[PDB]
Amino acid sequence: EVQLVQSGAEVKMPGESLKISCEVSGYSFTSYWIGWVRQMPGKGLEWMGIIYPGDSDTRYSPSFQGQVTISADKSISTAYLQWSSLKASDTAMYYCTRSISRSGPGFSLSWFFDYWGQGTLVTVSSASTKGPSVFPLAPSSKSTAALGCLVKDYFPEPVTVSWNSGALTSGVHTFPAVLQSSGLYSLSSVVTVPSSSLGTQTYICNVNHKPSNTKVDKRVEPK
Amino acid sequence: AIQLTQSPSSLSASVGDRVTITCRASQGISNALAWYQQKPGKAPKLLIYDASSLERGVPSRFSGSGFGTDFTLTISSLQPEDFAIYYCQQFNGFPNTFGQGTRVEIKRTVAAPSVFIFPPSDEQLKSGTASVVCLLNNFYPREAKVQWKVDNALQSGNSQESVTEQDSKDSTYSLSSTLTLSKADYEKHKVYACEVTHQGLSSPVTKSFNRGE
Amino acid sequence: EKNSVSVDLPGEMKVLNKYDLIATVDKLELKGTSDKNNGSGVLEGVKADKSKVKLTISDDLGQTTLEVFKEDGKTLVSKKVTSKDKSSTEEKFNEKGEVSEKIITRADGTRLEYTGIKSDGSGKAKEVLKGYVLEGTLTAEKTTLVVKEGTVTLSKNISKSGEVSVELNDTDSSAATKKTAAWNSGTSTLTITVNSKKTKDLVFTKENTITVQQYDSNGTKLEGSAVEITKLDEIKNALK
């Protein structure tokens, strides 16, 4: 039942402030440390800091001392990661992690992380944030028919794509986003379905782009 | 801090191969090591702590050992769902440090690309632009090639390709080639085709469709 | 039993396929699976408090590591590493994560105890010799053990590497009653001088004892034999 739920994705400009949260449940929140791990875009894992909500003891890694504020709230079972001012180089994915303490010889201790959050993406740029597209691609004269949806010209990644509002994950392929010549991403999601189901069954794709708050569902439409 | 160096960077093995990954430290961290498994997408997951003790729920095929500065993570019988990136971390000396990770791929048979094609939506042409999509589904290996016939005359620069990561069920791949053309030029042609050349083929496959027929 | 007879462990415990072994200590059985047929394997076991107990035996059969965790197998409560030569080091944790107590036990019975460890390292230091017991503090750079007799304070320092250094301070301000000291790191001797005249030598031995050798009247050479200290007041009497 141990679950670590994080906040949603964020879009910020250089200099703005931001605080992301990690809603906790499943265990004794006051007994375990709560850490924070950074993952630069497609890069390694950076540990930022940790907090013990029993006494609000913040142990900051020297690579982030005076660069980020880590707080906790025992009353609501929630930890926080707060920035004074965002810089363009702070774009990464951040995790809240439950930590297990180990007494490293000597005079100190460290931790390893057993349960992780889902991750919060912080994109920092001074460009326009545009919502995604709607266009579907239709099945016609297939082998098991195949269909899907097209998501063109959005900013910023990532966009979650579902099919039939869940309950459809057999042959669903969601392609990674490709940045076009214009500074906007584009991706597609496809499903492989039995060819005999077209008409007798309706298929809709549930796109969601919380950065621009855009969210669109569209149907195929095989013709 | 303490630098951690893993080995190797990438890796490829068939289903059943006993694969081992190493992690070398710069100091004596005798017992303080943890192993994580970041699967496609998100997110990291603890596999093995204290370099020997196995985490609950982790299958018995995962094992780990080490002492001093040389450590080794070991999968006994590789499985297709075990495709992920594996990190080692040290928690003996403040602060905690991670290794650069290790990629693990799966080897399987070849067939087949299973080409599909898709015409534009005709709602795109309300904006003067249109995108043609060619789909390749559940093939191996990752290497492939796609060409865009237009009046039996290939088109340049207007293509973009994206590949999925290795599937967790059948260890296959999938590719999407998108041809972006303007509506003013999309109607100057009738036949749009996608010539596919994959290692698993015996001859180039060409899925096509006449414009609005 | 059969095909796994027994073998004795470092710490008075016993340990006895589809190698397999079975152990038992502290009123309940611990079993696991080893790699060889000597006893080189871990032993799992559970306590009535649902606390997880783990016993790690080395491959050389000369280093047992007994660990105690909570209901989750990750958060530990105690950790006692016992070697073949009785060199033990038991730790206890304050449930915050930090080690609250560290009981270092040497081969010759002389234990070294640490209590009241704060979040930085400052804690009560107490060394248990044979016949007497020294007490002191613990700074983040050395272990300081102090013996006081009026104005004279005898400070036995212990560097983190393990070497022993000893100093002596005297708040007295009389050239005839003030006590200075001289240390020799090679010979491990502290020489007490009073009024430009040597008085006695204190040797801190590799057997973890202290010897006293009184100088003669003229302070030019030693005399007699050394007396191994058995009472704590014997250390104070030399500082009078």
XYZ file of C-alpha atoms in Angstrom:
676
model
C 0.000 0.000 0.000
C 3.121 2.172 0.217
C 2.575 4.875 -2.420
C 4.425 8.133 -3.115
C 2.320 10.465 -5.282
C 3.992 13.570 -6.710
C 2.614 16.778 -8.189
C 1.975 17.437 -11.873
C 4.320 18.719 -14.551
C 5.322 22.386 -14.510
C 6.252 25.045 -17.062
C 8.255 27.981 -15.740
C 10.338 30.891 -16.980
C 13.883 31.653 -15.776
C 13.627 33.455 -12.442
C 10.173 32.266 -11.379
C 9.598 30.294 -8.181
C 8.216 26.778 -7.879
C 7.335 24.316 -5.117
C 6.460 20.710 -5.951
C 4.914 18.311 -3.453
C 5.007 14.579 -2.718
C 1.805 13.298 -1.111
C 2.601 10.259 1.035
C 0.596 7.315 2.368
C 0.864 3.631 3.229
C 3.338 3.771 6.129
C 4.348 5.815 9.185
C 5.274 9.097 7.497
C 6.987 10.410 10.648
C 9.399 7.451 10.905
C 11.228 7.398 7.548
C 13.356 9.993 5.794
C 12.124 11.568 2.557
C 14.701 12.306 -0.131
C 14.785 14.041 -3.496
C 16.598 12.814 -6.614
C 17.196 14.779 -9.818
C 17.472 13.178 -13.266
C 18.794 15.557 -15.923
C 17.277 14.993 -19.402
C 18.347 11.508 -20.464
C 21.187 11.621 -17.933
C 22.314 10.126 -14.629
C 20.760 10.370 -11.183
C 21.545 13.310 -8.889
C 20.622 13.246 -5.197
C 19.581 16.709 -4.007
C 18.648 16.435 -0.340
C 16.646 14.691 2.358
C 14.267 15.492 5.216
C 13.225 13.702 8.399
C 9.693 14.892 9.290
C 10.144 13.818 12.920
C 12.196 16.959 13.562
C 12.345 18.627 10.101
C 16.058 17.905 9.694
C 17.161 18.966 6.204
C 20.425 17.402 4.998
C 21.372 19.232 1.796
C 23.856 17.810 -0.676
C 26.688 20.319 -1.265
C 25.857 20.414 -4.988
C 22.519 22.062 -4.087
C 23.206 23.912 -0.816
C 21.567 27.321 -1.004
C 19.966 26.346 -4.326
C 16.741 24.579 -3.276
C 14.540 24.366 -0.179
C 13.334 21.007 1.165
C 10.486 21.020 3.687
C 8.029 18.523 5.143
C 4.617 18.628 6.822
C 3.833 15.901 9.357
C 0.263 17.187 9.747
C -0.750 16.325 6.160
C 1.851 13.614 5.373
C 3.402 15.592 2.524
C 6.943 16.649 1.600
C 7.960 19.576 -0.588
C 10.734 20.693 -2.937
C 10.853 24.468 -3.386
C 12.918 26.788 -5.589
C 13.734 30.411 -4.815
C 14.237 31.297 -8.491
C 14.309 28.972 -11.492
C 17.234 28.894 -13.908
C 17.153 27.546 -17.453
C 19.580 24.748 -16.499
C 17.203 23.300 -13.870
C 15.088 21.419 -16.441
C 14.964 17.800 -15.244
C 12.739 15.108 -13.734
C 12.583 15.004 -9.933
C 11.710 12.080 -7.657
C 10.666 11.893 -4.021
C 12.057 8.735 -2.429
C 11.491 6.970 0.872
C 14.932 6.407 2.371
C 16.421 3.718 4.615
C 19.131 5.011 6.935
C 22.541 3.346 7.244
C 25.327 4.380 9.629
C 28.328 4.885 7.369
C 31.661 4.807 9.209
C 32.049 7.239 10.502
C 30.482 10.264 12.226
C 27.685 10.326 9.634
C 25.031 8.316 7.816
C 23.578 7.898 4.341
C 20.490 6.288 2.840
C 19.225 4.091 0.043
C 15.792 4.473 -1.510
C 13.297 1.594 -1.633
C 10.053 3.304 -2.735
C 10.017 6.021 -5.397
C 7.516 8.559 -6.653
C 6.323 8.672 -10.238
C 8.367 11.770 -11.082
C 7.665 15.460 -11.675
C 8.991 17.118 -14.829
C 10.024 20.779 -14.635
C 10.607 22.455 -18.004
C 12.253 25.888 -17.823
C 12.180 27.976 -21.000
C 11.153 31.437 -22.199
C 9.183 30.187 -25.219
C 5.463 29.964 -25.894
C 3.633 26.929 -24.487
C 1.309 25.642 -27.218
C -1.301 22.909 -26.853
C -1.302 19.710 -28.914
C -3.168 18.805 -32.113
C -6.185 16.555 -32.712
C -5.664 14.747 -36.002
C -6.471 11.006 -36.206
C -5.008 8.520 -38.696
C -7.604 6.097 -40.082
C -7.442 2.353 -40.785
C -8.023 1.234 -44.367
C -7.195 -2.098 -46.052
C -5.038 -3.585 -43.302
C -3.566 -7.062 -42.849
C -5.565 -7.377 -37.608
C -6.316 -3.756 -38.471
C -4.195 -0.906 -37.126
C -5.170 2.660 -36.243
C -4.133 5.494 -33.970
C -3.970 9.225 -33.348
C -1.550 11.999 -34.302
C -0.380 14.691 -31.864
C 1.324 17.525 -33.762
C 3.009 20.772 -32.717
C 2.889 20.903 -28.928
C 5.189 22.276 -26.214
C 6.414 21.030 -23.690
C 6.789 17.222 -23.390
C 5.463 14.897 -22.033
C 1.921 14.178 -23.197
C 0.024 11.163 -21.872
C -2.071 9.278 -24.436
C -4.716 6.738 -23.427
C -7.058 4.603 -25.523
C -10.755 4.112 -24.713
C -10.002 5.951 -21.443
C -7.973 3.014 -20.231
C -9.004 -0.625 -20.611
C -7.014 -0.813 -23.872
C -3.336 -1.732 -23.541
C -2.941 -4.909 -25.636
C -1.278 -3.475 -28.738
C -0.865 0.189 -27.811
C 2.380 1.835 -28.949
C 2.993 5.453 -27.908
C 5.981 6.840 -29.794
C 8.488 9.211 -28.165
C 8.160 12.866 -29.093
C 10.203 14.228 -32.005
C 11.078 17.923 -32.013
C 10.248 19.299 -35.457
C 12.017 22.121 -37.284
C 9.552 24.481 -35.644
C 10.233 24.399 -31.920
C 7.274 22.125 -31.179
C 7.191 18.405 -30.429
C 5.090 15.871 -32.321
C 4.275 12.227 -31.625
C 1.803 9.491 -32.522
C 0.028 6.677 -30.686
C -1.184 3.522 -32.437
C -3.159 0.385 -31.564
C -3.427 -2.988 -33.305
C -7.023 -4.241 -33.245
C -8.930 -7.156 -34.786
C -10.021 -6.051 -38.250
C -13.533 -7.452 -37.720
C -14.206 -4.984 -34.873
C -14.291 -1.769 -36.933
C -17.815 -0.380 -36.815
C -18.995 -2.779 -34.119
C -16.523 -1.132 -31.709
C -15.584 2.535 -31.337
C -12.031 3.664 -30.567
C -11.121 7.004 -28.982
C -7.738 8.366 -27.903
C -7.531 10.443 -24.714
C -4.736 12.990 -25.112
C -3.673 15.099 -22.126
C -1.198 18.010 -22.034
C -1.347 19.491 -18.520
C 1.400 22.098 -19.206
C -0.983 24.019 -21.481
C -4.008 22.472 -19.682
C -5.150 21.157 -23.078
C -6.994 17.832 -23.227
C -8.760 16.394 -26.276
C -10.503 13.111 -27.101
C -11.097 12.136 -30.729
C -12.595 9.098 -32.446
C -11.638 6.959 -35.423
C -13.412 7.219 -37.948
C -11.879 4.539 -40.201
C -12.980 6.135 -43.481
C 32.511 12.837 -3.572
C 32.948 9.142 -4.414
C 32.940 8.282 -8.114
C 31.222 5.079 -9.247
C 32.094 3.438 -12.573
C 29.923 0.687 -14.053
C 30.587 -1.773 -16.870
C 29.533 -2.203 -19.543
C 27.563 0.689 -21.044
C 25.230 -1.272 -23.342
C 24.518 -4.990 -23.430
C 22.611 -7.539 -25.505
C 21.736 -11.106 -24.522
C 19.132 -13.724 -25.374
C 16.371 -14.958 -23.067
C 18.137 -17.349 -20.699
C 21.647 -15.914 -20.617
C 23.198 -15.337 -17.193
C 24.146 -11.650 -17.420
C 26.396 -9.901 -14.893
C 27.007 -6.167 -14.422
C 29.908 -4.633 -12.496
C 30.200 -1.453 -10.431
C 33.608 -0.156 -9.322
C 34.075 2.419 -6.559
C 36.988 4.689 -5.678
C 37.025 3.836 -1.948
C 36.159 1.131 0.561
C 32.354 1.092 0.724
C 32.365 -2.523 1.868
C 28.620 -3.123 2.297
C 26.931 0.162 1.309
C 25.708 -0.490 -2.222
C 22.231 -0.569 -3.754
C 20.966 -1.662 -7.170
C 18.040 -0.038 -8.980
C 16.182 -0.865 -12.195
C 14.760 1.985 -14.294
C 12.404 0.486 -16.881
C 11.314 2.209 -20.119
C 9.636 5.450 -19.198
C 9.499 5.733 -15.414
C 10.528 5.016 -12.752
C 13.548 3.655 -10.802
C 12.876 0.651 -8.561
C 15.013 -0.808 -5.775
C 16.290 -4.299 -6.618
C 19.038 -5.226 -4.134
C 20.294 -3.461 -1.003
C 23.440 -3.971 1.101
C 24.932 -5.567 -2.064
C 23.674 -9.002 -0.997
C 20.166 -8.751 0.481
C 17.290 -9.054 -1.990
C 14.266 -6.761 -1.847
C 10.829 -8.293 -1.351
C 8.900 -9.019 -4.536
C 12.071 -9.077 -6.652
C 12.313 -12.493 -8.373
C 14.933 -15.020 -7.312
C 16.705 -14.748 -10.686
C 18.155 -11.409 -9.516
C 21.276 -11.652 -7.358
C 24.132 -9.439 -6.245
C 27.459 -9.664 -4.458
C 30.539 -7.595 -3.753
C 32.859 -6.236 -1.079
C 35.448 -3.487 -0.878
C 35.390 -1.607 -4.184
C 34.341 -4.224 -6.785
C 30.675 -5.236 -6.973
C 28.601 -7.327 -9.366
C 24.873 -7.476 -10.082
C 23.809 -10.811 -11.560
C 20.663 -11.948 -13.364
C 20.461 -15.744 -13.445
C 17.963 -16.445 -16.259
C 17.248 -13.349 -18.347
C 13.613 -12.535 -19.124
C 12.157 -10.145 -21.723
C 10.521 -7.973 -19.052
C 13.975 -7.480 -17.475
C 14.821 -4.992 -20.256
C 15.765 -1.817 -18.368
C 18.677 0.336 -17.204
C 20.403 -0.709 -13.978
C 22.155 1.752 -11.659
C 24.433 1.183 -8.684
C 24.743 3.653 -5.824
C 27.018 4.134 -2.821
C 25.776 5.196 0.617
C 28.932 4.664 2.678
C 30.342 8.173 2.291
C 28.247 11.332 2.269
C 26.876 12.279 -0.152
C 25.120 9.435 -1.964
C 26.428 8.916 -5.497
C 25.016 6.982 -8.447
C 26.675 5.132 -11.282
C 26.141 6.160 -14.885
C 23.915 3.100 -15.407
C 24.002 0.096 -17.713
C 21.742 -0.681 -20.668
C 20.462 -4.244 -21.102
C 18.798 -5.375 -24.339
C 17.216 -8.665 -25.409
C 18.164 -10.807 -28.410
C 15.425 -12.565 -30.381
C 14.467 -13.661 -33.899
C 14.024 -11.314 -36.849
C 10.561 -11.171 -38.456
C 8.667 -9.028 -39.041
C 8.178 -5.306 -39.821
C 4.393 -5.519 -40.482
C 4.142 -2.295 -42.465
C 1.065 -0.064 -42.237
C 0.361 3.308 -43.854
C -2.033 6.135 -42.999
C -3.412 8.990 -45.140
C -3.815 12.518 -43.742
C -6.884 13.371 -41.689
C -8.343 16.092 -43.995
C -8.663 18.214 -40.865
C -4.954 18.988 -41.184
C -5.654 20.477 -44.627
C -7.726 23.154 -42.893
C -4.278 24.512 -41.943
C -2.463 24.145 -45.278
C -0.299 21.257 -44.035
C -0.639 17.472 -44.055
C 1.298 14.568 -42.552
C 1.620 11.061 -44.007
C 2.466 8.246 -41.587
C 4.144 4.896 -42.275
C 3.977 2.336 -39.463
C 6.387 -0.543 -38.827
C 5.246 -2.815 -36.011
C 6.934 -5.494 -33.884
C 10.196 -6.151 -35.733
C 13.801 -6.955 -34.801
C 16.528 -5.753 -34.867
C 16.208 -1.989 -34.444
C 17.913 -1.283 -37.784
C 15.515 -0.412 -40.610
C 15.123 1.953 -43.554
C 12.121 3.828 -44.972
C 11.625 5.771 -48.222
C 8.727 7.979 -49.369
C 7.583 7.501 -52.971
C 5.687 10.452 -54.482
C 4.628 9.977 -58.123
C 7.361 7.318 -57.985
C 9.765 10.164 -57.169
C 11.161 10.141 -53.637
C 10.873 13.307 -51.499
C 13.649 14.913 -49.457
C 14.032 16.512 -46.038
C 10.340 16.298 -45.142
C 10.640 13.078 -43.105
C 11.035 12.327 -39.401
C 11.389 8.958 -37.675
C 10.843 7.743 -34.111
C 11.388 4.271 -32.649
C 9.909 2.678 -29.552
C 12.129 1.023 -26.989
C 12.356 -2.757 -26.791
C 8.951 -4.216 -25.969
C 8.549 -5.952 -22.612
C 6.475 -8.876 -23.964
C 8.143 -10.003 -27.213
C 11.296 -7.806 -27.183
C 10.236 -6.222 -30.493
C 10.520 -2.677 -31.848
C 8.240 -0.263 -33.683
C 8.968 2.748 -35.888
C 6.932 5.691 -37.178
C 8.019 7.629 -40.271
C 6.100 10.888 -40.732
C 6.124 12.754 -44.059
C 5.139 16.414 -43.617
C 3.845 18.006 -46.828
C 1.892 21.180 -47.507
C -1.697 20.985 -48.724
C -0.741 22.999 -51.815
C 1.689 20.206 -52.752
C -0.161 17.202 -51.297
C -2.823 17.635 -53.997
C -0.263 17.826 -56.833
C 0.139 14.030 -56.563
C -2.017 10.909 -56.404
C 0.162 7.998 -55.213
C 1.974 8.141 -51.865
C 3.948 5.014 -50.991
C 6.302 3.782 -48.265
C 9.136 1.474 -49.348
C 10.430 -0.476 -46.337
C 13.694 -2.443 -46.223
C 14.267 -4.492 -43.064
C 16.723 -7.295 -42.325
C 13.769 -9.633 -41.725
C 12.387 -9.062 -45.222
C 13.062 -10.915 -48.459
C 12.280 -7.926 -50.711
C 11.243 -4.287 -50.202
C 7.634 -3.889 -49.049
C 5.663 -0.944 -50.453
C 2.329 -0.007 -48.882
C 0.557 2.687 -50.893
C -2.793 4.394 -51.402
C -4.302 6.566 -54.119
C -5.257 10.050 -52.942
C -8.971 9.968 -52.130
C -9.973 6.716 -53.823
C 22.279 -33.661 11.995
C 23.327 -36.115 9.302
C 25.151 -34.696 6.241
C 25.454 -31.436 8.199
C 27.040 -32.267 11.535
C 28.005 -28.994 13.266
C 30.750 -26.405 13.598
C 31.424 -23.795 16.259
C 31.138 -20.090 15.500
C 32.805 -16.847 16.649
C 30.545 -16.158 19.623
C 29.572 -19.490 21.181
C 26.922 -20.480 18.618
C 26.367 -23.612 16.544
C 25.618 -24.102 12.857
C 24.845 -27.436 11.210
C 20.377 -30.307 -1.897
C 17.561 -29.089 -4.153
C 24.609 -26.160 0.090
C 21.883 -26.564 2.714
C 22.370 -25.805 6.403
C 20.331 -25.116 9.539
C 21.317 -23.099 12.617
C 19.745 -22.266 15.972
C 20.604 -19.684 18.633
C 18.751 -17.359 21.027
C 15.888 -19.804 21.641
C 14.801 -20.174 17.999
C 15.940 -21.779 14.755
C 17.507 -19.942 11.809
C 17.793 -21.621 8.410
C 18.940 -20.657 4.941
C 21.002 -21.949 2.033
C 24.789 -21.688 1.833
C 27.264 -22.029 -1.044
C 29.771 -24.479 0.492
C 29.546 -27.303 3.040
C 31.394 -25.525 5.874
C 28.860 -22.982 7.147
C 29.479 -20.037 4.815
C 25.954 -18.701 4.434
C 23.323 -16.331 5.757
C 20.724 -17.406 8.324
C 17.233 -15.898 8.338
C 14.928 -15.813 11.347
C 11.967 -13.961 12.861
C 11.346 -12.748 16.417
C 8.132 -12.648 18.449
C 8.208 -8.852 18.020
C 7.954 -9.489 14.236
C 11.490 -8.070 14.037
C 13.706 -9.535 11.325
C 16.931 -11.200 12.498
C 19.769 -11.919 10.064
C 23.054 -13.757 10.690
C 25.800 -13.367 8.072
C 28.706 -15.820 8.350
C 31.836 -15.081 6.333
C 33.411 -17.532 3.898
C 36.448 -17.943 6.181
C 34.168 -18.978 9.096
C 35.781 -16.306 11.267
C 33.466 -13.289 11.092
C 29.811 -13.510 12.153
C 27.509 -10.534 11.532
C 24.261 -10.662 13.519
C 21.718 -8.039 12.445
C 18.269 -7.123 13.772
C 15.737 -5.265 11.616
C 12.172 -4.037 12.039
C 9.150 -5.668 10.387
C 10.654 -4.359 7.144
C 13.946 -6.058 6.353
C 15.662 -2.720 5.708
C 15.601 -0.593 8.880
C 18.030 -2.118 11.383
C 18.021 -2.006 15.189
C 21.343 -3.575 16.222
C 24.463 -4.791 14.427
C 27.162 -6.847 16.175
C 30.190 -7.831 14.079
C 32.137 -10.580 15.865
C 35.501 -11.793 14.563
C 37.482 -14.960 15.259
C 39.790 -13.297 17.816
C 36.798 -11.985 19.847
C 37.237 -8.517 18.303
C 33.594 -7.425 18.498
C 31.879 -4.164 17.551
C 28.178 -3.877 18.420
C 26.093 -0.883 17.344
C 22.640 0.320 18.371
C 20.461 2.871 16.610
C 18.123 5.566 17.936
C 15.332 4.781 15.389
C 16.145 8.142 13.782
C 18.856 6.410 11.751
C 21.946 7.519 13.640
C 23.992 5.098 15.727
C 23.354 5.867 19.399
C 25.794 3.366 20.947
C 28.982 1.663 19.745
C 30.543 -1.026 21.952
C 34.016 -1.886 20.643
C 35.438 -5.006 22.310
C 39.082 -5.977 21.843
C 40.671 -9.430 21.895
C 42.091 -9.146 25.435
C 38.734 -8.348 27.065
C 39.278 -4.572 27.170
C 36.022 -3.049 25.927
C 35.576 0.477 24.561
C 32.089 1.905 25.086
C 30.431 4.970 23.553
C 27.090 6.304 24.801
C 24.993 9.406 24.216
C 26.003 9.980 20.596
C 24.402 13.165 19.264
C 23.661 13.906 15.598
C 27.262 15.105 15.091
C 29.476 12.724 17.079
C 29.777 14.256 20.542
C 29.182 11.479 23.051
C 30.255 9.913 26.314
C 33.442 7.853 25.975
C 34.262 5.147 28.526
C 37.071 2.596 28.214
C 36.828 -0.520 30.392
C 40.332 -1.587 31.404
C 41.070 -4.476 33.791
C 40.760 -3.350 37.409
C 39.705 0.216 36.585
C 37.666 2.206 34.070
C 38.526 5.436 32.246
C 35.898 7.956 31.146
C 35.999 10.833 28.708
C 34.387 12.656 25.808
C 34.291 12.091 22.044
C 35.069 14.877 19.583
C 34.781 14.499 15.817
C 38.589 14.295 15.466
C 39.770 12.048 18.338
C 38.708 10.164 21.465
C 39.663 12.002 24.661
C 39.873 10.225 28.026
C 40.609 12.424 31.042
C 41.763 11.592 34.575
C 41.718 14.493 37.042
C 43.436 14.949 40.413
C 43.035 18.497 41.689
C 44.691 20.794 39.158
C 46.406 18.124 37.037
C 44.381 16.639 34.167
C 45.719 13.577 32.332
C 44.348 13.498 28.774
C 44.727 10.212 26.873
C 43.885 11.039 23.267
C 42.954 8.404 20.683
C 43.280 9.403 17.039
C 40.731 7.982 14.616
C 43.506 5.912 13.021
C 44.025 4.221 16.405
C 47.334 5.629 17.674
C 47.519 6.887 21.262
C 48.787 10.333 22.262
C 48.843 11.599 25.850
C 49.184 15.159 27.163
C 49.069 16.763 30.602
C 47.807 20.194 31.667
C 48.273 21.807 35.084
C 46.428 24.933 36.219
C 49.083 25.333 38.927
C 51.282 28.427 38.675
C 54.207 27.655 41.003
C 57.605 26.791 39.528
C 58.121 24.255 42.344
C 54.692 22.565 42.168
C 53.768 22.940 38.479
C 53.827 19.676 36.522
C 54.887 19.554 32.875
C 54.933 16.449 30.698
C 56.960 14.935 27.870
C 55.576 12.401 25.392
C 57.473 9.899 23.230
C 55.259 8.445 20.498
C 57.813 5.751 19.665
C 58.328 4.391 23.179
C 54.736 5.271 24.220
C 55.936 6.891 27.453
C 54.778 10.068 29.196
C 57.477 11.654 31.368
C 56.293 14.000 34.125
C 58.701 16.802 35.055
C 58.403 18.991 38.163
C 60.608 22.058 38.752
C 63.145 21.235 36.016
C 63.442 17.757 37.537
C 61.951 14.501 36.275
C 59.576 12.599 38.556
C 58.192 9.465 36.886
C 57.362 7.739 33.604
C 53.978 6.412 32.475
C 54.011 3.788 29.712
C 50.823 2.937 27.809
C 51.373 -0.654 26.716
C 50.172 -2.606 23.696
C 48.451 -4.879 26.237
C 46.264 -1.880 27.214
C 47.863 -1.332 30.631
C 49.779 1.470 32.362
C 53.103 1.211 34.200
C 54.624 3.677 36.671
C 58.390 4.118 37.105
C 59.487 6.735 39.638
C 62.679 8.655 38.904
C 65.403 9.001 41.527
C 65.904 12.056 43.744
C 68.222 13.861 41.307
C 65.892 13.192 38.361
C 68.668 11.695 36.222
C 67.591 8.052 35.862
C 64.796 5.671 36.795
C 64.899 3.325 39.782
C 63.261 0.092 40.860
C 60.669 -1.750 38.796
C 57.405 -0.655 37.211
C 54.038 -1.073 38.933
C 51.108 -1.999 36.713
C 48.113 0.115 37.707
C 45.129 -1.787 39.118
C 43.116 0.918 40.927
C 41.973 4.195 39.397
C 43.280 6.013 42.485
C 46.770 4.796 41.541
C 46.564 7.004 38.444
C 45.360 9.940 40.548
C 48.083 9.364 43.151
C 50.745 9.770 40.453
C 49.249 13.173 39.551
C 49.380 14.506 43.133
